[PDB]
């Protein structure tokens, strides 16, 4: 806005406008040199309130680092600027409302200060008078500090004429008070206001090292110092290869404060695409995009998502589908019609027998009643299938019950169509007692 | 050289070589912030030319925002006054001028350059007379803006006591006239400064998104493909690894004004490096490196590299 | 003698000052016509009030130089202590300062005269 | 413990055990107004856990 930097040579009188234009210009570069890596404007390092005055409305505040996005620096720490106290009485819609801070604009002209004119055009400087000490040892002296006119606004008002943050959310409480979301964030220059991000981002990470332990105990089981010829290892390999690059990047960011955020989105962004190869029926899409105006839900929607994703079973595997039935011919439903390519049966119980004589009184141990249009094994069995009394049982049956086992053998027309059927039922009428069922095919 | 910090004691006068040494400093703290991030030295923010006026063979530009290796900043709607027109008449029969821009170097004796009258040392800081006043109230008195001493130097451009940055390159076309080429480009603080590359790299990654939604309609259709062990498929399995894992950063960074290219490389560099692996012969010199200073010869092989491996 | 929602003493024995109310004819009403004290806000970072640099958040503390002596001894002297800042406000003017107690209530008779009626009662600590 | 009580006269000069049981004085009255919180002894008004640094098998504070 036609900044004029001037030179100094000899005989130049003294004069405002030179110091004026030379401080902006110090300010426009400080900024320019800012919007070079990271193209983000600025935003929120702090914002705290007082909660103890909110009861009895009022609201009052005590540290505001906040950076407006034209270069502004806004410090109450070092420069004195707090706003008057914010009135409540004045809203009796108890929805919600939200408080946003401010600052005027208009100084083409001047935006200057005179106090006893009155306008409808705010003005955004003020003066003071203090007793700044000089820093070589001698008396101090009484001169005229700046201190910006800033302000405390609602965002349901017309905020034409100012440049605004929003810092903070109110809502209305059980008993008729007032009262804080912690769900909202502001934008931010820093991950150290708002604490519930850092929260929640720490939880992410405690989440995350829990389960490396458990894949490398998943290791210790087979000692795969070899070949293992399956879709398990690579899985496992493929899942460690996932995690253990994200933990020492992401452990640096969530030690140190004062990070920009773009820095965490870019990793977040990145383990979130590199463990959705399989998981989800989300595409690439879920991952969210990036809306540092106000982060509504660029973070929640994405950690909801990790937390999702951090499941991930490992697929060699076989199916436990619960028979339900009133009646005694226990039945269960949904087989899956890729199962054909090496289907077979090692369905299971759970009995109260003393002994192996429950091999007789399985009394139907041979030609149970496999398809859609079997109604009790007593009258309508099979032809061509036989049940192996199972005892000695071959590995990787996961929570195995011994003597309590049998196989399942079929024709090449029955086990077809009962596929196509998706239904099959079993065998015992008197096995209402202490009798449990579990379902079972593994893929040869 | 040698730079000096003032004391403001009180009882020491006045000199106006106090302020000029005060402000030849802070440009320095800038230089040593932004060399936290930086190889080597910068280029070109924005620069537009008006073509128009070439058929009476002339060159004039209209915006243009240049920084300079010392620290120096250039601005013409803030700052600074536009560089006088170029008169191409004495290379009127040749086929390439590369145009650069032109400060003067400055060196510790001289300073700004007192009407021309001794004009053997170029030098800058052209003065201005400006009256702009009205922070509390009032416009009226005059005070001395200072402007620099910008020009163009094309074709003996290299005989330069001078500091190059270049902008424009021009070719006879069929019909004997100068045209602006789309060509490459000397360097950039942006991704703004070269319309050809916002042309290019939108191409390159909605090339990108369309061969991964071919990949995933290929796989998740079909239940069993997701943990299977065919060779194509474990291969199919690791390459959208590989592109899953590096769309949503250049997708982040491409929807973007204005950020130094350095991070792009860095995030192209990894794409290249893993897809290299996976269906070649060839060797690994096929990454271009890195230079900044020459006007990039880099950033185009390196996505004629990418766009054959997709495909 | 009153206290205050943050655990302030105040007493008008022992650290006291108060101006008066000037006008009461500006509320041309009897029955909303009533008086509270003030003490003002907590502001994080200043302090007390020394000269004229009235800000739009006032300020609670003051200074004051009194003859204190209480020791081994007969000679008095002088030392600044530290008084605080009251005004009584009326109820409906604004909220900026604290007021937050009321302490009476003014209504007329008819011949203009204000009296304090009976049925009145600000929040009670003691009977 | 022998909480002492100093002496502030126009002789008397600095010391740290000027301060410190001065300190310790009102602390100690702060029990002696209690006439039912010594009845009941010494409470306990707010303890919140963490409960993610478990599988972890670590423990972490949050408010006391």
């Known amino acids: 806005m036609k900044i004029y930097r001037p030179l100094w040579e000899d005989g130049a009188f003294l004069m405002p406008q030179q110091f004026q234009q030379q401080a902006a210009w110090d300010v426009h570069l400080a900024d320019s040199v800012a919007r070079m890596g990271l193209a983000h404007p600025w935003g929120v390092v702090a914002a705290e309130f007082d909660d103890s005055l909110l009861p009895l409305s009022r609201l009052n505040a005590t540290r505001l680092i906040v950076r407006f996005p034209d270069g502004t620096l806004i410090d109450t720490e070092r420069a004195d600027n707090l706003p008057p106290v914010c009135d409540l009485s004045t809203v009796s819609d108890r929805s919600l409302v939200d408080i946003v801070l401010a600052l005027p604009l208009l100084n083409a002209n001047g935006g200057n200060l005179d106090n006893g004119s009155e306008s409808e055009r705010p003005r955004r400087w003020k003066s003071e008078r203090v007793n700044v000490q000089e820093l070589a040892g001698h008396e101090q002296s009484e001169v005229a500090v700046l201190r910006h006119n800033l302000t405390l606004r609602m965002a349901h008002q017309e905020n034409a004429a100012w440049l605004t943050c929003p810092v903070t959310r109110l809502v209305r409480d059980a008993q008729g008070q007032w009262c804080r979301d912690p769900r909202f964030i502001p934008p931010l220059l820093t991950l150290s206001a708002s604490p519930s991000l850092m929260t929640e981002l720490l939880e992410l990470l405690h989440h995350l090292q829990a389960r490396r332990q458990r894949l490398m105990s998943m290791r210790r089981e087979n000692n795969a110092r070899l070949a293992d010829f399956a879709v398990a290892d690579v899985s496992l390999f493929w899942l460690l290869n ?101 289907a077979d049966f090692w369905l299971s119980v759970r009995s109260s027998m003393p002994g192996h004589e429950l091999q007789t009184k399985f009394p139907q141990l041979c030609k149970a009643g496999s398809p859609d249009d079997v109604s009790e094994v007593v009258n309508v069995a099979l032809s061509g299938v036989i049940i192996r009394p199972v005892t000695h049982v071959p590995a990787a049956i996961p929570l195995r019950l011994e003597n309590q086992y049998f196989a399942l053998d079929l024709s090449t027309d029955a086990a077809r169509a009962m596929l196509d059927a998706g239904r099959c039922t079993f065998y015992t009428p008197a096995s209402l007692g202490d009798v449990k069922l579990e379902l079972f095919a593994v893929l040869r």
């Open 242 to 342: 996932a995690l253990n690059s994200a933990e020492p990047v992401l452990k640096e960011l969530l030690d140190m404060p004062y990070r920009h955020p773009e820095l965490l989105y870019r990793e977040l962004a990145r383990l979130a695409g590199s463990l959705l190869t399989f998981s989800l029926e989300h595409n690439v899409d879920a991952v969210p995009a990036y809306h540092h105006e106000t982060p509504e839900n660029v973070f929640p929607p994405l950690l909801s998502l990790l937390n999702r994703l951090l499941e991930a079973s490992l697929p060699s595997r076989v199916v436990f589908i619960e028979l339900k039935q009133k009646g005694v011919m226990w039945e269960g439903a949904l087989h899956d019609a890729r199962l054909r390519e090496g």
